[PDB]
Short mmCIF file of C-alpha atoms (C1' of nucleotides) and ligand atoms in Angstrom, two decimals:
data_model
loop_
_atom_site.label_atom_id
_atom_site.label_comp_id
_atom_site.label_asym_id
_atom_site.label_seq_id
_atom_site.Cartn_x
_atom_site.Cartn_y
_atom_site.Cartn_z
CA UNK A 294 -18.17 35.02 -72.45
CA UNK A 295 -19.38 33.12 -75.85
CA UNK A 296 -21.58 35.97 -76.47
CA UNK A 297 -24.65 35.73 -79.18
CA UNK A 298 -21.57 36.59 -82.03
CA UNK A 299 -19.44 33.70 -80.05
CA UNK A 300 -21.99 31.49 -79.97
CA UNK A 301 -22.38 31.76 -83.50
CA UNK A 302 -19.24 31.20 -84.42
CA UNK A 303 -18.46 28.82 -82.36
CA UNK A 304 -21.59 26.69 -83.73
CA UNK A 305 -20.54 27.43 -86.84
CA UNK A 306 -16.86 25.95 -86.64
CA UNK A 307 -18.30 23.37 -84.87
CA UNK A 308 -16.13 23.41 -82.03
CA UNK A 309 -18.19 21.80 -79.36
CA UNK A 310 -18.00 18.48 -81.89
CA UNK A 311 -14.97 17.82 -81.93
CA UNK A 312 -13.99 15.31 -79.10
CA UNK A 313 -11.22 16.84 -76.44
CA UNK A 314 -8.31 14.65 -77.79
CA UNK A 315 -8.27 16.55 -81.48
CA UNK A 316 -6.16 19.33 -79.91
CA UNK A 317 -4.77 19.61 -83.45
CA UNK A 318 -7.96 20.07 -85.31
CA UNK A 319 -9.31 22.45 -82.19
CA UNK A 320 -6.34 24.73 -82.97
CA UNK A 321 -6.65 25.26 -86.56
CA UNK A 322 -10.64 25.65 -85.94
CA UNK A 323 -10.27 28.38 -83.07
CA UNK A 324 -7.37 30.24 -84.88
CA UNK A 325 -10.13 30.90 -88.20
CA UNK A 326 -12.77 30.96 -86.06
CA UNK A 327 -11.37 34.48 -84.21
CA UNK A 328 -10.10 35.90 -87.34
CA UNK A 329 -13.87 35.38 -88.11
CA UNK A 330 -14.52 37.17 -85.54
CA UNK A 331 -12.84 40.00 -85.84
CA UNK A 332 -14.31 40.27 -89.68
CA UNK A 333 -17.64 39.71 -88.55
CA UNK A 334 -17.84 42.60 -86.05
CA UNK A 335 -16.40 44.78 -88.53
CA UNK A 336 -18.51 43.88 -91.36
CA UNK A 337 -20.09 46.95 -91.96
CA UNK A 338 -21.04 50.26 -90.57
CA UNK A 339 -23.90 48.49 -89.19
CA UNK A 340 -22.18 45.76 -87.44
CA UNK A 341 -19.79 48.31 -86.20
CA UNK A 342 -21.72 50.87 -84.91
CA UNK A 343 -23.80 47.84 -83.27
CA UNK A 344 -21.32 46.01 -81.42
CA UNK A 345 -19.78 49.43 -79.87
CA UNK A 346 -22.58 49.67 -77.85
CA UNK A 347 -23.23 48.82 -73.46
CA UNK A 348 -25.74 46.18 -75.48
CA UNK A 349 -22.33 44.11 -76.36
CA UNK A 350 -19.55 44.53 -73.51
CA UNK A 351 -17.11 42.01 -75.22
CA UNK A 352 -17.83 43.20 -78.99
CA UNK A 353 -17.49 46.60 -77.67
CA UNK A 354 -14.09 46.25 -75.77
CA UNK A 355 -12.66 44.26 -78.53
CA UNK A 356 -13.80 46.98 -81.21
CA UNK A 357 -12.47 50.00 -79.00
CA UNK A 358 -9.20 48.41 -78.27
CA UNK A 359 -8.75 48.19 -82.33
CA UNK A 360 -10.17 51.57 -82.77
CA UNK A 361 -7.47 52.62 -80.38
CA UNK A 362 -4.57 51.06 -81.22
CA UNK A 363 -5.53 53.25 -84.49
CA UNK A 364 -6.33 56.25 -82.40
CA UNK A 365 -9.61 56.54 -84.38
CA UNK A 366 -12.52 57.79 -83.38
CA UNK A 367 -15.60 55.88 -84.24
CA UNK A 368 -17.87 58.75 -84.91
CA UNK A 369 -15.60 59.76 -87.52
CA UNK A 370 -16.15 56.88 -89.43
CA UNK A 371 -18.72 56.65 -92.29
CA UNK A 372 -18.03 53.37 -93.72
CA UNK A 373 -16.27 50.12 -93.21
CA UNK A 374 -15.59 46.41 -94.56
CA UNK A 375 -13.22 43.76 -93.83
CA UNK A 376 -12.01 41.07 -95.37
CA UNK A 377 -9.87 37.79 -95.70
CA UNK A 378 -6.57 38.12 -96.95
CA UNK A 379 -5.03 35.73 -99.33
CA UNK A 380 -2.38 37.24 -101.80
CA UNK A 381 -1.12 34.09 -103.28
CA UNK A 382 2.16 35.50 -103.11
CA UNK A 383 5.34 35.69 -101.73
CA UNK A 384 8.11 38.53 -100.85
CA UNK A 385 11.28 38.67 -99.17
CA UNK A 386 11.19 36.49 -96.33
CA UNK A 387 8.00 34.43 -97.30
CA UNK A 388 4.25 34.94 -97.42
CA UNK A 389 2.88 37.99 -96.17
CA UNK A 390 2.16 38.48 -92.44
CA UNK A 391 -0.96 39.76 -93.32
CA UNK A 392 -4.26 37.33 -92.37
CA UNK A 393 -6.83 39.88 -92.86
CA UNK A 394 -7.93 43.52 -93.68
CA UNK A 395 -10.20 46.09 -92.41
CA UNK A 396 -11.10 49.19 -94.50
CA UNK A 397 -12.22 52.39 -93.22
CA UNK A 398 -13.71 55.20 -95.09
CA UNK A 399 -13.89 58.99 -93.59
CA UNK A 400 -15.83 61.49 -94.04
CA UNK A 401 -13.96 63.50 -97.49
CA UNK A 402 -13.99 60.43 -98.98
CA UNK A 403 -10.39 59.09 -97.72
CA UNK A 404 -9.98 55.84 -96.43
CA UNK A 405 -7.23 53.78 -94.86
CA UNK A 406 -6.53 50.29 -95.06
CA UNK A 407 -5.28 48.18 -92.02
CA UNK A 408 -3.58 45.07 -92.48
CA UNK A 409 -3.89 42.43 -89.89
CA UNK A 410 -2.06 39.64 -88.00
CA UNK A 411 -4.20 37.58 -85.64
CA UNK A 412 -3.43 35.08 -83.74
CA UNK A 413 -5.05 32.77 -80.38
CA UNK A 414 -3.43 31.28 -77.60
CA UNK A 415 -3.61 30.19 -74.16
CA UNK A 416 0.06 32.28 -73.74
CA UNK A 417 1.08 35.70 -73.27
CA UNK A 418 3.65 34.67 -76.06
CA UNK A 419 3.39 32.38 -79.37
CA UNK A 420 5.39 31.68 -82.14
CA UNK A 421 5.34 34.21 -84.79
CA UNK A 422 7.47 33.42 -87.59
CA UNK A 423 10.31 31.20 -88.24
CA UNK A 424 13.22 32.06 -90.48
CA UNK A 425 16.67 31.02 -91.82
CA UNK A 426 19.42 33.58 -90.42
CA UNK A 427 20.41 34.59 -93.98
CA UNK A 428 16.61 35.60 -94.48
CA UNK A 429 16.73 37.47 -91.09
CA UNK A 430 20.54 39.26 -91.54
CA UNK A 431 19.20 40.11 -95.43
CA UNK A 432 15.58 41.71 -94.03
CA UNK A 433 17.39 43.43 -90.76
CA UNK A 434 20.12 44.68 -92.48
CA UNK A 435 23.00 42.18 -91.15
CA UNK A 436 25.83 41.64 -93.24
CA UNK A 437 28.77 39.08 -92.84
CA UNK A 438 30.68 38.69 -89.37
CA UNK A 439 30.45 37.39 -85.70
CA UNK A 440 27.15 38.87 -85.38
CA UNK A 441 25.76 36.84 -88.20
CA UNK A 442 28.04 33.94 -86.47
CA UNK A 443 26.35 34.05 -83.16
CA UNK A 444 22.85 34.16 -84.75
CA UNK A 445 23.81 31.07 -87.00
CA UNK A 446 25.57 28.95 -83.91
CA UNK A 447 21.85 29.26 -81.78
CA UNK A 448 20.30 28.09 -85.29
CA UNK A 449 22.49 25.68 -85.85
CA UNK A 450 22.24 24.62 -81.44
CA UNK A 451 18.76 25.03 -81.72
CA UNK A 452 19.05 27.19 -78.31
CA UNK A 453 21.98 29.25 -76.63
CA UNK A 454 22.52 26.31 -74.64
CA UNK A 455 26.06 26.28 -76.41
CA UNK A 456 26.83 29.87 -76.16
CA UNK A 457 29.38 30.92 -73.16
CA UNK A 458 28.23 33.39 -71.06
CA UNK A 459 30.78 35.70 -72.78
CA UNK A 460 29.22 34.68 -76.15
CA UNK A 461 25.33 35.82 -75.00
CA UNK A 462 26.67 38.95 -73.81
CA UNK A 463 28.79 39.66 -76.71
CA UNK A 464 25.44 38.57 -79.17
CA UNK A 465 23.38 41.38 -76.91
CA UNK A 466 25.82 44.04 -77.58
CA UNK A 467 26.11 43.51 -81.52
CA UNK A 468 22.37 43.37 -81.73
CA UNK A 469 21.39 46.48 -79.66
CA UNK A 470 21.68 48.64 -83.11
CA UNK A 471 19.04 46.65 -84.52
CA UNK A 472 17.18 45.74 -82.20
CA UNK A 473 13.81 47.72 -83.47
CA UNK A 474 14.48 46.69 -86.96
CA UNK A 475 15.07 42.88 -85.70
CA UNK A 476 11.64 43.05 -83.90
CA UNK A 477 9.83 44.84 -86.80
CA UNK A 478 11.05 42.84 -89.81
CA UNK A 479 10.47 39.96 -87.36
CA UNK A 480 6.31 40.42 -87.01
CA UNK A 481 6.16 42.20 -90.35
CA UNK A 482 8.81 41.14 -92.96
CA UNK A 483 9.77 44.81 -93.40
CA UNK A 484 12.49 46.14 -90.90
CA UNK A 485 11.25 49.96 -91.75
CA UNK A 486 8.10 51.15 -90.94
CA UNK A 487 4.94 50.69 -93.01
CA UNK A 488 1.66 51.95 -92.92
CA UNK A 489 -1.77 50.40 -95.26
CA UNK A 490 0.71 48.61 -96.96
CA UNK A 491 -0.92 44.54 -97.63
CA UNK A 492 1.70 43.01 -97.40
CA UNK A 493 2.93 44.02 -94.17
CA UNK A 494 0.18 43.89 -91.09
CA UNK A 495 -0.33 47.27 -89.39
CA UNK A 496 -1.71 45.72 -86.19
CA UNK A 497 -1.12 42.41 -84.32
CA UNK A 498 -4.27 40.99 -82.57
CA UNK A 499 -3.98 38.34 -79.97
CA UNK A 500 -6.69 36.43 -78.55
CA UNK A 501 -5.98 34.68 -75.08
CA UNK A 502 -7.86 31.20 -75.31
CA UNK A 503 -8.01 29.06 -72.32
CA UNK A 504 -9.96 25.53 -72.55
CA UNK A 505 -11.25 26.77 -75.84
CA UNK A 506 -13.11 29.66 -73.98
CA UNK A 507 -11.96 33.37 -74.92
CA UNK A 508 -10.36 35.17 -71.86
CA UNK A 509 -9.32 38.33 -73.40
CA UNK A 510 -7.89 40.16 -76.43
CA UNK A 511 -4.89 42.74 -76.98
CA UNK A 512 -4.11 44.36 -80.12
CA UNK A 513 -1.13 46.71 -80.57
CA UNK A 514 -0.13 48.93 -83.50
CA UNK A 515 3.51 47.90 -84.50
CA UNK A 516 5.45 50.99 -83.22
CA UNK A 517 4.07 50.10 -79.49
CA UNK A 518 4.62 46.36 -79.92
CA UNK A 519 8.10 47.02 -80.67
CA UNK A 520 8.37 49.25 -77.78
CA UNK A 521 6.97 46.80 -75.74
CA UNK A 522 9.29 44.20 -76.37
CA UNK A 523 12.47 46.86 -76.20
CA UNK A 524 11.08 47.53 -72.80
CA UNK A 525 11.03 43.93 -71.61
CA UNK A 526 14.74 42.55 -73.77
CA UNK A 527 16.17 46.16 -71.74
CA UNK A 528 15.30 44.51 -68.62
CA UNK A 529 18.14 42.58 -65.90
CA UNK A 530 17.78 39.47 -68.43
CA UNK A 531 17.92 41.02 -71.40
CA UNK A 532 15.54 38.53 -72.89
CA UNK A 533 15.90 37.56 -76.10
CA UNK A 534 19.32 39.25 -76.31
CA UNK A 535 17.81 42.34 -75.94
CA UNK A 536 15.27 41.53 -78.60
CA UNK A 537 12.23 41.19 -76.24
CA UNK A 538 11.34 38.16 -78.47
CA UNK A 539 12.22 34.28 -77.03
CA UNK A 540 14.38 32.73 -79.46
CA UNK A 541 14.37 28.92 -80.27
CA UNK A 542 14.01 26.68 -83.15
CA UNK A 543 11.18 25.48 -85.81
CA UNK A 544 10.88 21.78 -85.68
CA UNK A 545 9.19 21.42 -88.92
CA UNK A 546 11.97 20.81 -91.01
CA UNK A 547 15.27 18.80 -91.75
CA UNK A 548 16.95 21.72 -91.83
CA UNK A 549 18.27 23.99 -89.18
CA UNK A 550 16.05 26.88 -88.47
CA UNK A 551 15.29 29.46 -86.38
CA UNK A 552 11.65 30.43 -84.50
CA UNK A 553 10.50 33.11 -82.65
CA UNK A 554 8.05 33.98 -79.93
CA UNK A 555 6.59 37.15 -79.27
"C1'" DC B 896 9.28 17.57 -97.18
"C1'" DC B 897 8.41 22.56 -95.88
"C1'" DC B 898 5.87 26.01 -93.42
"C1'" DC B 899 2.38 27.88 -90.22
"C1'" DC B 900 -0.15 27.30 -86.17
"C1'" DG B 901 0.43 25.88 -81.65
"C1'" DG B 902 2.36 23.98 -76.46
"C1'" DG B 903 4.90 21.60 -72.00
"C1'" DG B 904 8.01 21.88 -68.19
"C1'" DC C 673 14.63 29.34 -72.18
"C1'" DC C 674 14.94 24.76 -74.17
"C1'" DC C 675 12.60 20.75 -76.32
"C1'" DC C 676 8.67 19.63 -79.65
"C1'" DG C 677 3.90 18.20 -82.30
"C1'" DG C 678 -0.50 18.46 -85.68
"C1'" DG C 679 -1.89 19.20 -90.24
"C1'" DG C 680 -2.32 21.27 -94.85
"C1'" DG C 681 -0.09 22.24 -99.42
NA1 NA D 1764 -6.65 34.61 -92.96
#
DNA sequence: CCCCCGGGG
DNA sequence: CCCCGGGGG
């Protein structure tokens, strides 16, 4: 529902301007526009406190489900800001996954930070990073050997299209030790956990947008995330080899590279 | 040219 | 899963 906040925004990106055919441009807009969105409605105790209300269903759902994913309880908040996050910087593995930040402040004073990821599309899955295999074997912890092999013949395939069925078996089984630290350092660029740390987001908010309309949100911590997509690579399938994630390839360079979906 | 944000079938 | 594109720095 473009709510009176939606509405806003969505004047205010101009979205309803730009003619059906500049799907490019529509993208980009959308994907600041909801990062917007998330800052706006928690730009202050005031906003907050307004938009968790019966007076703003949407607002309200979207705020809870963050709150949640914190397991913190509004009340016990005294103060909050947000804000855009742009570092400047680089780490192991690239720029920070971080697009944003939300601070709260409790009542003795403390505060946590809460680094952010957020994302929009019309799937249940989009791309989320893309990464040379040395980057990925140096962050996960993978040194030398036919499980660094495997990973480097689907980068070098561009798929598993290659791979025997022996082969995507065998990749499955060398992976299962890592799989947690392959999904984490995957969405975070840090295979251990982290918690208010910038550079690494704490929560991964994604915004289902159908014919430029918002549909629904869902925002998981990192620990359930990761569960999440253990529980779906465990399955029959074992998707992703094991990983949960769909692995394929970046197309923006000359260079053979790795993507991944989650 | 590389990287980040996306999608079709 | 496999095959790909728009756009900014
Ligand atoms: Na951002």
């Amino acid at each position: 529902m473009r709510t009176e906040l939606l509405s806003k925004l969505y004047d205010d990106f101009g979205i309803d301007q730009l003619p059906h055919t500049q799907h490019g441009v529509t993208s980009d807009r959308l994907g600041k526009l909801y990062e917007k969105y998330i800052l706006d409605i928690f730009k202050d105790i005031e906003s907050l406190k307004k938009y968790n209300t019966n007076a703003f269903p949407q607002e309200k759902d979207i705020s809870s489900k963050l709150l949640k994913a914190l397991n913190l309880d509004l009340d016990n908040i005294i103060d909050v800001s947000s804000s855009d996050t742009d570092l400047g910087r680089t780490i192991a593995g690239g720029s920070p996954k971080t697009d944003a930040t939300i601070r709260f402040t409790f009542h003795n004073q403390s505060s946590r930070l809460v680094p952010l990821n957020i994302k929009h599309s019309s799937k249940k899955k989009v791309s989320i990073a893309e990464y040379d295999v040395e980057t990925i074997c140096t962050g996960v912890g993978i040194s030398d050997g036919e499980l660094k092999e495997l990973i480097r013949k689907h980068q070098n395939d561009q798929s598993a299209k290659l791979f025997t069925p022996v082969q995507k078996q065998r990749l499955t089984e060398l992976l299962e030790p890592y799989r947690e630290r392959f999904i984490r350092w995957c969405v975070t660029l840090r295979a251990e956990k982290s918690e208010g740390n910038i550079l690494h987001p704490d929560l991964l908010i994604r915004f289902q947008v159908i014919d430029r309309e918002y549909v629904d949100v869902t925002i998981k911590n990192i620990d359930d995330y990761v569960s999440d997509r253990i529980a779906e690579g465990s399955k029959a399938r074992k998707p992703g080899f094991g990983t949960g994630l769909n692995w394929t390839y970046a197309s923006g360079s000359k260079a053979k590279k790795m993507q991944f979906k989650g």
